[PDB]
Amino acid sequence: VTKRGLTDPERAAIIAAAVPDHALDTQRKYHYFIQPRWKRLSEYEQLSCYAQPNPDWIAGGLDWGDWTQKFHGGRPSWGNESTELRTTDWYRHRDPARRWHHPYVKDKSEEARYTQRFLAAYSSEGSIRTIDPYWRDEILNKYFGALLYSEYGLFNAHSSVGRDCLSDTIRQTAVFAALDKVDNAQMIQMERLFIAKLVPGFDASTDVPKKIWTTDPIYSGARATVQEIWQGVQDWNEILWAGHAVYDATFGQFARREFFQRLATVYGDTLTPFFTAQSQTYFQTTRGAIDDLFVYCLANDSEFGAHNRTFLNAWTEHYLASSVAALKDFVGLYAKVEKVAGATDRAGVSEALQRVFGDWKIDYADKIGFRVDVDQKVDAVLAGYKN
Amino acid sequence: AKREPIHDNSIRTEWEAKIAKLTSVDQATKFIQDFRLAYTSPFRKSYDIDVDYQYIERKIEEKLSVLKTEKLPVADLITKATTGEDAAAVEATWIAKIKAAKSKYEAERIHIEFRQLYKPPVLPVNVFLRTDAALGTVLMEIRNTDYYGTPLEGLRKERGVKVLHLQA
Amino acid sequence: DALKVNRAPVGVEPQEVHKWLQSFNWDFKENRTKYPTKYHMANETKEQFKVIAKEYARMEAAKDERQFGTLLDGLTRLGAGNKVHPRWGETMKVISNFLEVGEYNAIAASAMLWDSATAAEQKNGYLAQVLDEIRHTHQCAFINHYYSKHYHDPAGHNDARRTRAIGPLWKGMKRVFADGFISGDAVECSVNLQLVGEACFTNPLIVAVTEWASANGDEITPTVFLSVETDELRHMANGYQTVVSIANDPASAKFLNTDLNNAFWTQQKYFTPVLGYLFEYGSKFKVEPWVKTWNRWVYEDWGGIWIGRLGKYGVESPASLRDAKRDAYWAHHDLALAAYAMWPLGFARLALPDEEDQAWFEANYPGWADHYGKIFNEWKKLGYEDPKSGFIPYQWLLANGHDVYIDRVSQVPFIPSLAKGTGSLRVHEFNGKKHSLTDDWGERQWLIEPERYECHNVFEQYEGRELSEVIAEGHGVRSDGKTLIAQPHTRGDNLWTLEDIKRAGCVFPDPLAKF
Ligand SMILES: [Cl-]
Ligand SMILES: [Cl-]
Ligand SMILES: [Cl-]
Ligand SMILES: [Cl-]
Ligand SMILES: [Fe+3]
Ligand SMILES: [Fe+3]
Numbered sequence A: 001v002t003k004r005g006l007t008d009p010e011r012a013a014i015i016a017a018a019v020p021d022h023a024l025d026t027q028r029k030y031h032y033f034i035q036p037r038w039k040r041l042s043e044y045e046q047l048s049c050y051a052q053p054n055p056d057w058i059a060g061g062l063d064w065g066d067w068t069q070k071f072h073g074g075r076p077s078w079g080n081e082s083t084e085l086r087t088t089d090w091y092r093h094r095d096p097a098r099r100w101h102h103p104y105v106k107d108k109s110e111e112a113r114y115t116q117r118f119l120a121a122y123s124s125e126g127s128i129r130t131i132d133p134y135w136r137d138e139i140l141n142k143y144f145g146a147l148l149y150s151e152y153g154l155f156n157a158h159s160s161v162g163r164d165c166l167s168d169t170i171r172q173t174a175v176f177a178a179l180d181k182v183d184n185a186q187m188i189q190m191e192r193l194f195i196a197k198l199v200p201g202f203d204a205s206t207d208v209p210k211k212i213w214t215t216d217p218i219y220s221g222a223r224a225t226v227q228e229i230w231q232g233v234q235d236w237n238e239i240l241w242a243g244h245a246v247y248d249a250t251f252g253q254f255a256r257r258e259f260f261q262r263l264a265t266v267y268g269d270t271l272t273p274f275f276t277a278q279s280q281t282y283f284q285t286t287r288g289a290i291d292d293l294f295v296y297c298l299a300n301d302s303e304f305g306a307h308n309r310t311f312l313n314a315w316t317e318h319y320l321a322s323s324v325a326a327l328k329d330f331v332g333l334y335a336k337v338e339k340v341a342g343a344t345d346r347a348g349v350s351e352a353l354q355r356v357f358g359d360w361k362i363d364y365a366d367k368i369g370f371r372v373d374v375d376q377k378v379d380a381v382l383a384g385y386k387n
Numbered sequence B: 001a002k003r004e005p006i007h008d009n010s011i012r013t014e015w016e017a018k019i020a021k022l023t024s025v026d027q028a029t030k031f032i033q034d035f036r037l038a039y040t041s042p043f044r045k046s047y048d049i050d051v052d053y054q055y056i057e058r059k060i061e062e063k064l065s066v067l068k069t070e071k072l073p074v075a076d077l078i079t080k081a082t083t084g085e086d087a088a089a090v091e092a093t094w095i096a097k098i099k100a101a102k103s104k105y106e107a108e109r110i111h112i113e114f115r116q117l118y119k120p121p122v123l124p125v126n127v128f129l130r131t132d133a134a135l136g137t138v139l140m141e142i143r144n145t146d147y148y149g150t151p152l153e154g155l156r157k158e159r160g161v162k163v164l165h166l167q168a
Numbered sequence C: 001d002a003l004k005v006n007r008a009p010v011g012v013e014p015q016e017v018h019k020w021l022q023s024f025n026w027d028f029k030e031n032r033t034k035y036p037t038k039y040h041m042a043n044e045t046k047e048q049f050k051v052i053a054k055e056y057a058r059m060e061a062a063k064d065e066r067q068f069g070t071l072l073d074g075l076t077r078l079g080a081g082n083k084v085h086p087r088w089g090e091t092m093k094v095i096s097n098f099l100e101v102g103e104y105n106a107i108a109a110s111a112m113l114w115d116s117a118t119a120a121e122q123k124n125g126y127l128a129q130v131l132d133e134i135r136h137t138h139q140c141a142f143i144n145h146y147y148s149k150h151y152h153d154p155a156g157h158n159d160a161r162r163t164r165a166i167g168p169l170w171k172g173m174k175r176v177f178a179d180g181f182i183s184g185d186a187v188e189c190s191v192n193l194q195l196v197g198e199a200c201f202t203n204p205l206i207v208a209v210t211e212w213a214s215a216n217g218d219e220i221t222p223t224v225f226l227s228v229e230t231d232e233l234r235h236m237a238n239g240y241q242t243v244v245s246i247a248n249d250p251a252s253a254k255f256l257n258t259d260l261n262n263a264f265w266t267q268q269k270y271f272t273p274v275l276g277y278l279f280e281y282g283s284k285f286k287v288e289p290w291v292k293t294w295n296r297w298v299y300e301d302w303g304g305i306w307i308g309r310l311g312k313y314g315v316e317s318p319a320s321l322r323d324a325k326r327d328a329y330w331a332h333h334d335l336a337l338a339a340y341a342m343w344p345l346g347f348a349r350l351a352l353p354d355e356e357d358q359a360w361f362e363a364n365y366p367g368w369a370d371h372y373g374k375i376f377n378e379w380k381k382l383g384y385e386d387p388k389s390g391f392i393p394y395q396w397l398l399a400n401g402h403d404v405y406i407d408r409v410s411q412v413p414f415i416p417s418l419a420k421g422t423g424s425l426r427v428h429e430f431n432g433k434k435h436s437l438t439d440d441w442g443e444r445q446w447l448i449e450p451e452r453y454e455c456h457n458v459f460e461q462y463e464g465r466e467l468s469e470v471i472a473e474g475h476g477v478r479s480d481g482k483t484l485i486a487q488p489h490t491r492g493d494n495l496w497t498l499e500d501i502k503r504a505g506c507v508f509p510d511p512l513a514k515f
Helices: A008-018 A043-048 A101-125 A133-164 A167-196 A207-215 A216-232 A235-265 A271-297 A305-336 A346-368 A374-382 B010-019 B025-039 B053-071 B076-078 B088-099 B104-118 B127-142 B154-161 C014-018 C053-078 C086-116 C120-150 C161-166 C168-182 C186-215 C221-230 C232-244 C249-281 C290-308 C321-327 C331-341 C355-366 C371-379 C394-397 C440-448 C456-463 C467-474 C498-504
Strands: B160-164 C425-432 C433-437
Touching: A008 B088, A043 A167, A043 C120, A101 A167, A101 A271, A101 C053, A101 C120, A133 A167, A133 A207, A133 A235, A133 A271, A133 A305, A133 A374, A133 C086, A167 A235, A167 A271, A167 C014, A167 C086, A167 C120, A167 C498, A207 A216, A207 C249, A207 C456, A216 A235, A216 C321, A235 A271, A235 A305, A271 A305, A271 A346, A305 A374, A305 B053, A305 B076, A346 A374, A374 B104, B010 B053, B010 C456, B025 B053, B025 B104, B053 B076, B088 B104, B088 B127, B088 C290, B160 C467, C053 C221, C086 C161, C086 C168, C086 C186, C086 C221, C086 C232, C086 C249, C120 C221, C120 C232, C120 C321, C161 C168, C168 C186, C168 C249, C186 C221, C186 C232, C186 C249, C186 C290, C186 C498, C232 C249, C249 C290, C249 C321, C249 C331, C249 C440, C290 C321, C331 C371, C331 C394, C355 C371, C433 C440
Parallel strands: none
Antiparallel strands: B160 C425, C425 C433
């Protein structure tokens, strides 16, 4: 047992004699000089802000001088060459959920433990007995399984973002977004593995989902888009915007919410809504942070807003076209489902697309000045609905 | 002799005055290329603004980038360098150059000069980053081959340093 | 059917999901790393720990709750934040904030390694580390946040993310634990971060810090750092798997041992002098002499056992290990001379060794008394601690021909005329600029890769400026705007102000002008 200065009598007396009898400064607010976004400086800001050691030649940095070690050739540890977008201060971003590591894992732990309690009870209840078998076996298992590859690809798009991005609050937003996406993929597979325990003959292998993702026309446009966002570019703002604010906000929201979640509740599926509840909660949390970065910080930067909008509008034109093509392919899946009027007929799909594109116009397009005719995009996708 | 303060000083102010006079993409591209050749890398022409050149370069980049978005067709922001060259053609030229390099000394200067001439906003970011990565792969492969094989005395001569002091 | 089903209670355990993770990646032409690299990590690489996202969060949240309970409930009730010996409370300003940058840059490094890998399992192992290094950034922040609230001197605990920029020891920390983690071939970065940084230094260092802390009355740092330590084995495993993943690439035999040797030299060049200085001079109560610790950590545990386990993948112990060991006897005492002499550029309050400390130094480092002990005692007699004295030892160094140089590669200071360590000065002029190097390994790095090593040093930035102006511009003051954060003693009276610094007239020279 080692002596400890807090409890050992001799050492505690020595320490007490050494400690001044008054405080040597009154400023007890950690990183008191951070500009607060809200009425009072938050713990999230105190623990996160200025952790990244940027010099004055990266907008907002408080340090000085060149980096100590660069890449062969001269690429800097972090640099302005990493993105087309420009700002007066890369540190400005704030996640409205104020997630540092602790609240992030605390919340996900709650979901982790509750999920296992729910599954143990759901299996004990026998509630799988009323699911439509064709939905379970031919649509959910195969095409919801295949969707895990979209989530997994969007996850991986964040690898270069996590390396390249230019501030601490942005890096946290990006990493938490990435983990939520791989969580979505893992949760889809968890659902399939659980069903396999309840339904003799139900195959939870990824072989069929992967074959569908990689070769079925229904996912051809989606996979092409994900491959481009992940591996076709390296501008870290382009990746976050294209991935979350265009592709996932249109194709991803349609597939998860309008197809799998919504149709689960017309085909007697009492299990899938528990899983889509998590992915949709994560989507809205991620959206809050993506919105702050791209709207408050970048599209409305006092010096570079118009410049940034020029790039954001160009990216949106391109990736919206890709996402429309992805949805046009995807709506071919309705040819395979049992008709339910108002849900799976052409008129029901039209209303679903009107929700996705109409919500997207308000939530993102309007905020960056991107003009979009909602009915045009709906009609373009419905051209893929089979007669 | 005596440095001015770090973040606000007469050298940075003088260069900000020069940058404010740039009015076209062509003019700002020549300005930034000349600046990077003159003041950046171990092969720069002058260390006269050493403690200020990185901040000044940032401000030139900002000026050129805004001139691009104000003056150029949007498609050119994706496919062209601000020199007017096709961006994929620039990539092809410089990859070919470094693949033909016969020594680490030829290769290092090719990579350095590519960055001096084409660092964003001159070349589009996505094209630049993938070209820079391809060049760095080749440069490292050459440099890291038999890395300890030349004695320091030989490396000093190959680099061309003037040796001013060697502690006994 | 609709009536019959097995109603046994079942869930899905994390390893049941992890079994399928490797199958989540798919083949396409562009599916390859974006970063420059000499190596290819094999597509079938596995990972040691079978952690999925939900389980990651469950396991880390449980550790957090125990840690934050101790800090915010128990230690606050005990008033423990002000029961730390002042020397150690000051040392923790530096240890926690400097380690914080390593935690922070390790996030980005681990993401670059996630990009470098093709196997989903190897990506996932690097991803766990990405998340852990965020956790650790906020944990180091929390230590200084807690000290800011509860310790008798919050200055410097409360603003190091800007005040660290004033001083020269910060530049060297950025080389080993910021730029060295992220700037280069991903495999070179992995050897700097995981194979050397973590397996050689961070893993034992985090624990040792807790032992020095508890010995000196600090129960805050053990609470946090002992929790940080539970995450580190996964990161060391990531480094092991980096080597496994490239072992069948012919490039590994060509290049890996060079990247490893360069990274080993990089890390030890800073930690060998700096850690021994912080432990031995930044403490009252002593745990173990640094010379003994270094040999156990670096030469025996790491260079012998831990690197030996990679012999089956072609890894050799670093060629520069013997040279590093030769410098570990006195390097931290040499650094102490520079740190005490340049105290006004720091953000911590220093204490010259007292009579009992001097006896400990001479017992464990015979020869210390006749060199460093006499120097420190002379500085005290000349007024080191006394703000009326106009005395700062950097000026004494210059007046007596003991110039301070900065290594262009490592940024570590060097005083050749007083050093008992093994460095030696080389000064070269290249293309109109002079450069000082201090050892054979770093000189080679600079000669081969000059464009990687263009860091401005404090003498170049501050040349000809007076010290109090530099400190004021850099915000190196307390909330009254005039009393320095840094001090040359740990007492509550006679604190130095900007005016006291100005009285000394310390103006920075160009140390290479003479050459
Ligand atoms: Cl500020
Ligand atoms: Cl079945
Ligand atoms: Cl010139
Ligand atoms: Cl041309
Ligand atoms: Fe860590
Ligand atoms: Fe670690």
